[PDB]
Design an enzyme around this catalytic site. Structure first.
Site, PDB file in Angstrom:
ATOM      1  N   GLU A   1      24.170 -28.836  35.839  1.00 42.74           N
ATOM      2  CA  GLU A   1      23.212 -29.791  36.356  1.00 42.74           C
ATOM      3  C   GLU A   1      22.149 -29.113  37.209  1.00 42.74           C
ATOM      4  OE1 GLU A   1      25.334 -33.069  38.055  1.00 42.74           O
ATOM      5  OE2 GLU A   1      23.447 -34.114  38.540  1.00 42.74           O
TER       6      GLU A   1
ATOM      7  N   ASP B   1      17.164 -37.930  44.096  1.00 38.78           N
ATOM      8  CA  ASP B   1      18.041 -38.844  44.817  1.00 38.78           C
ATOM      9  C   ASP B   1      17.840 -38.741  46.328  1.00 38.78           C
ATOM     10  OD1 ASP B   1      18.746 -39.067  42.137  1.00 38.78           O
ATOM     11  OD2 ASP B   1      20.937 -39.349  42.554  1.00 38.78           O
TER      12      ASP B   1
END
Ligand code: WJT
Length: 763
Positions: A733, A536
């Site tokens: 994550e 990202d």
């Protein structure tokens, strides 16, 4: 084609509703779906706040997930609910037979925890809906006045399922009895059923539909003079008036005081005799045995993780990953304007693309279906394209035929051009959780083609009835090549699409290189982000620029060509295989000519200057290692050796907890949202580990540095994930490189589960 149908029949039913705590649906768009709800009731207003349905993670829930799961057989889920003082087990089991995809059963067991009041009242609902024009479902009425003393039987039929019965058994546990006046109209307390109908497209909204019925019950109390002078107990105020019948929705409600359990038995009529509770128990015990034997064979944990603690860990990470598998169906939201602003061809393109987006020409289209595993039940319960390539690496080991099914499912979404949307949000249920400003897909947005990695593994396995079915596509070479034959054209179509839509610009600048062809730039980048690359907020050229080239993207194209070589070769697409060879050779040269920095000792992305020259932009981290991670560099390459230096360098990438996404030396370390700007991510660590092992099990100059790095990185990654699991019960994550702590979202199974394959080893 024969194996296809057996595979179809095997996988048809499951608990394919990972977005909720527990529910079943078959791999059919418009069919029979079930879902579990439960919540304590202590007052007249609390049940709306305690009831559970869709998955979440907060302070009220200690944890939940699958202890064991195989989508062919079933499994056992554990739910630890603090708010509701309850530890729940849901066992699901499939019984093959008949013509309609077999039968299934589930046991729901609730045990109050030590903190709960021993006389807690818990409301439990089993919600059943059926979509389709010409299908029937009916609740057989009870003999008793106000509800069921015993089991609730639903009789239904459809084209898809033929005839079936669904039984919710009486179950075991104290059922509370009310002495109130009301009991003369509503019964003292018993299981009840409401059979309703709503327009098909809203059947999914189980919570509101239930509450609407509860509310109408309370309104009836109020109108009929039941009031605060003398109120019925809470649990009776929230017990629906019994009204079974026919409809497309059926609510089965129970109240228990103390511990409880009850069965759900789905009996496919076209099969032998109907499913019993004794059958459920037997088939449950049998599944556990098969699960056990298979794990030991497929996931043989090597030193130093052979211990039982690591086994349990490995079983939990694996079961939750494969347990995430969902079937999703419906319309997706797509901008099909192909606005010219999306070609992103001038400077400042991001502002133009914002202008186009602000036209809102996106429309629903489809419907589509997708059978896929997911990154996370509570937060991301839907298909993500590059994530799934990672999910299937452990899954393919377990059941190659399942993985190929899932690959086929994804590929079946590819439009005429070669585009699969990177995020598949299919239908209103799938949409409900996702904010509007995030739904729209864009046909110029790629995502890494990690699904080829899985394909690669299948290919190498190919070169060298549930038992049988899992491996039929490798045990029968004929079947294999046929699968590859049918998919091969979509692979190529995706290849070509990358090259038409994600093309970088050599020819129009002062740029020299071995090939005038090979150069790539992810579309869809904003000033601070590049979402399509998967990383990202990994720092990229500032400002973004039509001249940018991205070394990760080129390496992925490298991955793809290589796969096309092997698959083409298996199918004899000679003309194809020769073209591929020229592309491979050219990407190899061009990775050096456009991406290699001798000055810095790694690969970098590129732009073009204020003064219109090619400039390298080096931010040492994952991106820097791409040609290595993606398997493209030769084992004697000096460049590889320098990347090995970078990888092992504690002051850049190497933390005690794994490789850092970004170097501690980079100016962007730990800045901003700090998503991919320092944290340790298992997916990329996994690729490093596999590549180190490769350079390590081959003669060459770096064999032994690779052996050392492999050994240590495998250890660090597994131990970090294990330690966190042991402490918190979750996969996370990403992991903090300074503290080792898991952070961002939980229940990330999720590529974090790759750890089961890192442990098992032998690449
Ligand atoms: C505040 S939020 O909890 O962050 C949040 C954000 C967003 N929208 C953007 C987003 C989407 C996915 C990821 C994770 N991850 C980031 C990786 O970098 C990619 O490589 C991976 O492919 C990708 C998938 O694993 C991160 C961000 C949706 C929800 C949501 C959706 C449905 C229901 N409830 N909530 C919650």
């Amino acid at each position: 084609s024969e194996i296809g149908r057996l595979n179809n029949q095997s996988l048809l039913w499951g608990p394919y509703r990972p977005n909720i705590y527990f529910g079943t649906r078959p791999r059919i768009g418009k069919s029979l779906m079930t879902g579990l709800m439960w919540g304590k009731i202590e007052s007249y207003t609390d049940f709306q706040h305690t009831v559970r349905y869709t998955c979440e993670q907060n302070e009220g829930m200690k944890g939940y997930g699958w202890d064991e799961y195989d989508p062919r057989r079933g499994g056992i889920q554990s739910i630890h609910d603090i708010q509701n003082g309850l530890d729940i087990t849901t066992s699901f089991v499939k019984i093959p037979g008949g013509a309609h995809g077999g039968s299934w059963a589930a046991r729901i067991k609730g045990t109050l925890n030590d903190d709960a009041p021993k006389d807690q009242k818990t409301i439990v609902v089993f919600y059943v809906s059926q979509e389709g024009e010409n299908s029937e479902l009916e609740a057989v009425p009870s003999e008793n006045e106000f509800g069921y003393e015993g089991d609730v039987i639903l009789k239904g039929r459809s084209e898809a399922l033929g005839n079936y019965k669904l039984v919710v058994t009486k179950g075991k546990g104290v059922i509370p009895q009310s002495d109130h006046d009301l009991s003369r109209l509503r019964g003292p307390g018993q299981t009840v059923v409401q059979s309703l109908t709503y327009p098909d497209e809203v059947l999914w909204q189980a919570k509101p539909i239930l509450f609407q019925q509860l509310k109408a019950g309370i309104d009836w109390l109020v109108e009929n003079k039941y009031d605060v002078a003398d109120p019925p107990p809470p649990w009776q105020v929230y017990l629906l008036a019994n009204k079974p019948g026919s409809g497309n929705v059926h609510i089965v409600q129970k109240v228990f005081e103390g511990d409880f359990e009850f069965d759900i038995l789905f009996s496919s009529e076209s099969a032998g005799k109907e499913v019993t509770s004794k059958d459920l128990e037997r088939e449950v015990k049998q599944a556990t045995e098969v699960f056990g034997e298979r794990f030991a064979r497929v996931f043989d944990l090597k030193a130093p993780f052979q211990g039982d603690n690591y086994k349990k860990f490995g079983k939990s990470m694996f079961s939750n990953l494969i347990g995430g598998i969902g079937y999703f169906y419906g319309h997706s939201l797509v901008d099909r304007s192909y606005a010219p602003e999306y070609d992103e061809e001038n400077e400042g393109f991001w502002e133009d693309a914002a202008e186009a987006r602000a036209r809102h020409q996106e429309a629903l289209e489809g419907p589509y279906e997708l059978f896929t595993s997911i990154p996370s039940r509570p937060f991301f319960p839907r298909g993500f394209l590059w994530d799934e390539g990672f999910h299937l690496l452990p899954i393919a080991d377990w059941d190659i035929d399942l993985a190929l099914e899932i690959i086929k499912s994804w590929y079946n979404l590819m439009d005429e051009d070669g585009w699969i949307a990177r995020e598949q949000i299919l239908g209103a249920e799938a949409r409900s959780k996702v904010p509007k400003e995030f739904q729209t897909q864009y046909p110029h947005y790629a995502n890494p083609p990690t699904l080829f990695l899985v394909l690669d593994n299948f290919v190498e396995r190919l070169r060298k009835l549930d038992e049988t079915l899992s491996t039929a596509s490798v045990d029968n070479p004929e079947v294999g090549l046929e699968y590859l034959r049918r998919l091969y054209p979509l692979l190529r179509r995706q290849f070509d699409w990358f090259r038409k839509t994600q093309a970088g610009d050599i020819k129009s600048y002062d740029r020299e290189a071995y090939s005038t062809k090979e150069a790539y730039r992810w579309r869809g980048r904003t000033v601070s982000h590049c979402l399509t690359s998967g990383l990202d907020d990994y720092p990229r050229p500032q400002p973004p620029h039509p001249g940018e080239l991205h070394v990760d993207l080129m390496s992925w194209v490298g991955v793809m060509v290589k796969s096309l070589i092997s698959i083409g070769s298996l199918l004899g697409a000679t003309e194809d295989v020769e073209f591929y060879t020229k592309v491979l050779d050219a990407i190899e040269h061009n990775l050096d000519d456009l991406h290699w920095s001798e000055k810095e000792g790694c690969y970098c992305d590129a732009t073009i200057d204020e003064f219109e020259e090619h400039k390298l932009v080096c931010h040492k981290g994952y991106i820097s290692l791409f040609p290595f991670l993606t398997g493209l560099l030769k084992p004697d390459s000096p460049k590889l050796g320098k990347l090995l230096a970078l990888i092992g360098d504690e002051s850049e990438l190497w933390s005690p907890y794994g490789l850092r996404s970004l170097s501690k030396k980079d100016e962007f370390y730990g800045t901003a949202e700090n998503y991919w700007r320092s944290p340790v991510w298992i997916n990329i660590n996994y690729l490093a580990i596999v590549q180190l092992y490769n350079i390590a099990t081959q003669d060459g100059p770096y064999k032994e540095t690779a052996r050392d790095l492999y050994t240590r990185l495998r250890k660090n990654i597994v131990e970090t994930v294990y330690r966190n699991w042991e402490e918190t019960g979750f996969a996370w994550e990403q992991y903090n490189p300074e503290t080792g702590k898991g952070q961002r979202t939980q229940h990330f199974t999720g590529w974090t589960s790759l750890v089961v394959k890192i442990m098992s080893g032998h690449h």
